[PDB]
Specification:
part of a larger assembly; 3 chains; A: about 425 residues; alpha/beta; 6-stranded parallel sheet; 3-stranded mixed sheet; about 40% helix; B: mainly alpha; two-stranded antiparallel sheet; 2 strands; structural protein; gTuRC; gTuSC
């Protein structure tokens, strides 16, 4: 099968840039997508094939109210993906409703990408959770993907711009994203810039640069999460082979994140599972435990060690799983997509679902609860209004996230034998 | 010497702290591969995790207890021992007539 | 079980930084945080560890009147001492009121380590007892650890008012902090300031500028005090045991010190311990006694002579201790410290519970009485007066250390056969 990758919104596209250039550099791929270096893994998860060996990345750059994008257009990665698709407001409901306004202009991409296919599986949306273009349009667009492709998975490989959250609509905005990215979406992954910012100071004293800087850790997370698909392996060969194992009902499908050698400028697999079980390496930010975990292992590790190390974690009882059922963990192994700069040769990543880490969504909604009785930023700008004037839809979005949080906090109870 | 004669006490302030609550049960109430995997775990964080022949350590059990020298329920602490595998080059030295005394010395210690 | 360093205040951080510098000489750790090229020893007993070999100090640095740590954050060892937290009067209750408003941050910081650390042993406090915020904040933090983590021994290596007594509010400071030592600390391996500094003038010309040169010697006192924790040995690999044989009751919890080639500008163990047992080398200054002796040697020397040496002290009666029940002399050969070069090719340290330390508390009480009978340095500042509106914690501070004087006198004779 195949995957389409969408990056969108002016904020989010700064990340989507780095993501696609990392995906390139992780393979034998030139800036134009023509022949380079090494083949023997399969490129045709993401790289469709042109008539003459241009490895067409099934990749799209989308935005609203453009400003930075002249840099993106002339950047050499525009030679890599060019199905001639490269298109050119900032609060959620305006971003949603201006997404609707441009709908027929933008939609002509989606079906061409889908016709250049044998078997499509899903759409990535590298969207920005606080933005109106970043996740107003980013919420709207995957809702059109549901309305036109109701059986193909949207994967919401987001970024969260937390620096004490500035965007004045951030709680209101990302609350309505927590409707569209939960109820109107198939799966989600989020990267948090407070935890990545603290990690940035833990190498250089990167505290302010953050954005300008963190994108490297970001890009090594995204590409590593998908070499496991491309590497001919016994399992995890497709996107549902990642998503199927770690979600008890598809609305709390927001995966948290983790990566070990964050600060770096033999180890064994026991290192990555213990070190990435550290609360200081929880890369997202009253009794709680995990729902489920991913723990990708990469590199030339001994494949015998992975079962035995799991037994040692079972003896250490660090693995606080959910209060029901056989919920457990698979040590997913791949060759990293080699010959990129291989720092920390054997390395690992914790995409996961954890009931306390619903904090990234309940902090958002607690901040919405702070503002909703102020009437502070429901400010009804001429497209922020006309999506829904009274914002009883925002109140509906709140009760949907109160189900989202109470579903995490009911997953924290032994009986999933009643509604969450 | 680091294990039976116990000069690497670093090893045991982990190992027995992990294994103690399993060893509070009587004999025939114990899970031996669980114990073996607890060995090779204290032996990870410990300084002991540097030796080329550390993998030869086995958990075994003595019955008869320190009453050995000329009931069954009091166990764990009363019944625990290490052992080593040997090979025909070194078995002419470090065989059971020696190791049984290394166990007895370890048991008392 | 791994040790939570908890150093605070300027002098505590000056000795702490030099102690970490000394540990980075006694272990193969680079100034740049990583493993040193140089590199059978365990480091995680004291140092935090990320998988990229960043053997970070578990420091918990704190200030209220900013003067110290920004002057320490300039050496090349700064890549080791990233604790993330560097948080910002000289009189007791005013120093206590500038404390205690800082509460949730310290709780979060110590919880973050107490949760992330593998196996929690105990909190090694290092701070002023004489004055500064130590008078105040120092006693305040020593009023929280008791409730924060009640199931671990709160050690102190804290440093005592002995400076000929501007810091003229030292008697009140000392009395109040000495109550918090006697009632709330679980051990006090005390040292007494100019009683070291005047031995510093004995060994070298440092008439006055030697306070910084105490920090060199006390760093060897700290590193010596941890020798058989940091290197393999048959017994005493742990904090609790290093204190458990020497402290008889939760009241008699102070410990005294002494060092062997202190005149650092071969003989047998009899020579070094005969030199060491002279109260000339006990650097703190009714016929009183110890309770127990612990003295530790490293070098090429065999153990066979330590028994012979105990017979020679036993026959000499060179130093004598009659606690009402016996608690012995305890001496051990240990591995010589690696990486750093060292003179005096066999060397060691004594610690013993020398009840004569009562005389220092009595000098403190005499200085408190001679200032309390005139009362010039009340200051009449409003959070010195009304923060302690009936003076009762000054007033009872004397008698509770007097119970340590009295329990020492009683325990030193065939008495003390009851509590109270």
């Amino acid at each position: 099968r195949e995957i389409i990758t969408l990056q969108l919104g002016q904020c989010g596209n700064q990340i989507g840039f780095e993501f696609w250039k990392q995906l390139c550099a992780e393979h034998g791929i030139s800036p134009e997508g023509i022949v380079e270096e090494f083949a023997t893994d399969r490129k045709d998860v993401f790289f469709y094939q042109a008539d003459d060996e241009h490895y067409i990345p099934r990749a799209v750059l989308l935005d609203l109210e453009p400003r930075v994008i002249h840099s993106i257009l002339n950047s050499p990665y525009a030679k890599l993906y060019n199905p001639e698709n490269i298109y050119l407001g900032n609060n959620w409901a305006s971003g949603f409703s201006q997404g609707e306004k441009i709908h027929e202009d933008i939609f002509d991409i989606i079906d061409r990408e889908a016709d250049g296919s044998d078997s499509l599986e899903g759409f990535v949306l590298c969207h920005s959770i606080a933005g109106g273009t970043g996740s107003g349009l980013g919420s709207y667009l995957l809702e059109r993907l549901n309305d036109r492709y109701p059986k193909k998975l949207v994967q919401t490989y987001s970024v969260f711009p937390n620096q004490d959250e500035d965007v004045v609509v951030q709680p209101y905005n990302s609350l309505l994203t927590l409707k569209r990215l939960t109820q109107n979406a198939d799966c989600v992954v989020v990267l948090d810039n407070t935890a990545l910012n603290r990690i940035a100071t833990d190498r250089l004293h990167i505290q302010n640069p953050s954005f300008s800087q963190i994108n490297q850790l970001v890009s090594t997370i995204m590409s590593a999460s998908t070499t496991t698909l491309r590497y001919p392996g016994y399992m995890n060969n497709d996107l549902i082979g990642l998503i199927a194992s770690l979600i008890p009902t598809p609305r709390l499908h927001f995966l948290m994140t983790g990566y070990t050698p964050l600060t770096t400028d033999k180890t064994t697999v026991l290192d990555v599972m213990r070190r990435l079980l550290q609360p200081k390496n929880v890369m997202v930010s009253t009794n709680h435990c995990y729902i489920a975990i991913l723990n990708i292992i990469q590199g030339e590790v001994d494949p015998t060690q992975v079962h035995k190390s799991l037994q040692r974690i079972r003896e250490r009882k660090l693995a606080n799983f959910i209060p029901w059922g056989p919920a457990s963990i698979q040590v997913a192994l791949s060759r990293k997509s080699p010959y990129l700069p291989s720092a920390h040769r054997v390395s690992g990543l914790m995409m996961a679902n954890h009931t306390s880490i619903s904090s990234l969504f309940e902090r958002t909604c607690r901040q919405y609860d702070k503002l909703r009785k102020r009437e502070a930023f429901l400010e009804q700008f001429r497209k922020e209004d006309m999506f829904k004037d009274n914002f009883d839809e925002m109140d509906t979005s709140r009760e949907i996230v109160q189900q989202l949080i109470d579903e995490y906090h009911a997953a924290t109870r032994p009986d999933y034998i009643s509604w969450g | 010497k680091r294990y039976f004669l116990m000069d690497q006490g670093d090893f045991f302030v982990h190992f027995m702290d992990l294994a103690e609550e399993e060893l509070r049960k009587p004999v025939e109430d114990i899970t031996p591969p669980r114990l073996e995997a607890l060995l090779e775990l204290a032996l990870r964080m410990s300084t002991a995790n540097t030796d080329p022949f550390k993998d030869d350590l086995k958990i075994d059990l003595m019955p008869h207890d320190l009453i050995t020298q000329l009931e069954l329920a009091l166990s764990g602490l009363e019944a625990f021992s290490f052992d080593y595998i040997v090979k025909w080059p070194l078995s002419l030295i470090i065989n059971r007539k020696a190791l049984t005394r290394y166990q007895m010395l370890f048991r008392h210690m």
